[PDB]
Amino acid sequence: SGFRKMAFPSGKVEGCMVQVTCGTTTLNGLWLDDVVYCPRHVICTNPNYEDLLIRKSNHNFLVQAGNVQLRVIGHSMQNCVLKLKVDTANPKTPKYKFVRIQPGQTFSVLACYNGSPSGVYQCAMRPNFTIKGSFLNGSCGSVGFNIDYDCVSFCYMHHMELPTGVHAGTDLEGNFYGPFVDRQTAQAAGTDTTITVNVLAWLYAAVINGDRWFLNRFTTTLNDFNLVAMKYNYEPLTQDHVDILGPLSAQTGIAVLDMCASLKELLQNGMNGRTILGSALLEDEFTPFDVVRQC
Amino acid sequence: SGFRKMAFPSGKVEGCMVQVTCGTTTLNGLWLDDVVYCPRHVICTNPNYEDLLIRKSNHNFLVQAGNVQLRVIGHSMQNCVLKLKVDTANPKTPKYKFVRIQPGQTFSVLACYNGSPSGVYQCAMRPNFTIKGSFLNGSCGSVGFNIDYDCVSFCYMHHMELPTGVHAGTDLEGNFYGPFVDRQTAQAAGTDTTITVNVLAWLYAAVINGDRWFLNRFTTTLNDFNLVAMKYNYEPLTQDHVDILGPLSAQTGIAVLDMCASLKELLQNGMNGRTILGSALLEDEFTPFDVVRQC
Ligand SMILES: *C(=O)c1ccc(OCc2ccccc2)cc1F
Ligand SMILES: *C(=O)c1ccc(OCc2ccccc2)cc1F
Ligand SMILES: [Br-]
Ligand SMILES: [Mg+2]
Ligand SMILES: [Mg+2]
């Protein structure tokens, strides 16, 4: 029993983190096989990164894997990341993939400074393509990931913090999540919404854990629910979301539309001072998979 | 910016987790140098563990470090843990200590099943010596730890789940946290209280992150505050707690007793639908050190 914000074990990723310095700029890099990936921000001083990279030599890049220096033998830019070929393949390279996630999905973040991992925590990609992370100066290049069996699916590299305190980054192919750019502008996060399918998954988690006070005998229609969800700034719930919640509906014996009626009531009346799984608000950063994995 | 429940990187501990089987009972063990530590529960079938262990041979213990079997060459019981001497020292042994923590302190938990790490999350030792963990069948032997520089301070080994869904375990010397025993009784968690110094540290974290709506011009006395804290089931705040909060008080320019007046108001009036650091309730599982580490 119990339900916590649970991250994946970070060992396999810790073995891949390195430090990258170019000029007076230092940040984190990801060392997989004979390639080090890092944000192209490291060559900064409306910049034109194509020019900046042409004006650079392999010897301008100091790559340090702990107490060992790696020799850069080739550099190239892939969108907003840099690929630095090095003369040494990482002996700790796990089986891995580069995957881009969808809004509503979760991933574990290994916050790193000067190539040294500092902490690990769970994050969700918000509907507005930001993440509510925890990052200080020097965290550029920290990566987010999931694990399936033995394979590390990298999905996020950290770049910048937006004015509202939220964070923006790219996939490992260097393509930004959301309408953000790696330069100094007035860019701000767009209006966010609540991830409805996740709130429902979390309600199932509560039931599985013996928290049932919010349940009711009623059942609603998918239409009538979405009419209420939109009013409260919730994402629309689709039939695919219902099918995805299938396994949890079976384990608990509560039909999805039955749970949706409980959610509707919670939106319209609040919690009346009660809590669900130790929370006084509806949590939406647990996916259906996250619940099954932990329950 | 940002504030998350952040665990320590688990790599150094992942390399120490093994599987231990005796009879049809399998659970997790901690392999450090040439010793494997695990709960004495593994020799179970008001048991008398001294008898049970006398009736066992080194060959009755199957220890598997991944795909490699370890040969047990000696066994002994230290309170509620077992020490299984093996013919092979763990080459991945980090610098480590066995430390017992105080109620109110936090630690990272690496939940493990069949010797395989599954997830990592942050926990606090409650005033009643339970932890609100996330553990399923097979999690016996999962460990909690902190990291200081390169040294892993192990502080918890998981044993059992209590009726209310909370968890009880021991330090690595086999001594239980709280008045719990490793046998089947009606034992239940005692009444819990809120960790006041932690709530204050978390309020400082909010201020450091730009959440200031709860602040007020007032300041209270340590006496007058504790009179209110006791009413709301909060731990007493001591002058040592005030001194510990010193660094955060300096960084923010808010005297501790000034923050205590904000806390008093929050207890007496609630949050009026607002949130602090994304929470609608007063969070008490962040220590002052946790805040400094992350802010
Ligand atoms: C770190 O990797 C990183 C990446 C992108 C950033 O974008 C904002 C910015 C501001 C000023 C100059 C260039 C880019 C910031 C970072 F820290
Ligand atoms: C796992 O390691 C473990 C340890 C102690 C436990 O105590 C409860 C109990 C119940 C029945 C027989 C013996 C002990 C339970 C565990 F799972
Ligand atoms: Br909350
Ligand atoms: Mg219902
Ligand atoms: Mg005040």
Curated annotation (Swiss-Prot), chains A, B:
Enzymatic reactions: TSAVLQ-|-SGFRK-NH2 and SGVTFQ-|-GKFKK the two peptides corresponding to the two self-cleavage sites of the SARS 3C-like proteinase are the two most reactive peptide substrates. The enzyme exhibits a strong preference for substrates containing Gln at P1 position and Leu at P2 position
Means of activity regulation: Inhibited by pyridone-containing alpha-ketoamides compounds 13a and 13b. In turn, alpha-ketoamide 13b (tert-butyl (1-((S)-1-(((S)-4-(benzylamino)-3,4-dioxo-1-((S)-2-oxopyrrolidin-3-yl)butan-2-yl)amino)-3-cyclopropyl-1-oxopropan-2-yl)-2-oxo-1,2-dihydropyridin-3-yl)carbamate) inhibits SARS-CoV-2 replication in human lung cells. Inhibited ex vivo by michael acceptor inhibitor N3. Inhibited ex vivo by compound 11a and 11b.
Active site positions: 41 (for 3cl-pro activity), 140 (for 3cl-pro activity)
Cross-link (Glycyl lysine isopeptide (Lys-Gly) (interchain with G-Cter in ubiquitin)): 5, 85
Subunit field text: 3CL-PRO exists as monomer and homodimer. Only the homodimer shows catalytic activity. Interacts with host FBXO22; this interaction promotes the proteasomal degradation of nsp5.
Role description: Cleaves the C-terminus of replicase polyprotein at 11 sites. Recognizes substrates containing the core sequence [ILMVF]-Q-|-[SGACN]. Cleaves and inactivates human TRMT1, preventing tRNA guanine(26)-dimethylation of tRNAs. May cleave human NLRP1 in lung epithelial cells, thereby activating the NLRP1 inflammasome pathway. May cleave human GSDMD, triggering alternative GSDME-mediated epithelial cell death upon activation of the NLRP1 inflammasome, which may enhance the release interleukins 1B, 6, 16 and 18. Also able to bind an ADP-ribose-1''-phosphate (ADRP).
Protein name, UniProt field: 3C-like proteinase nsp5
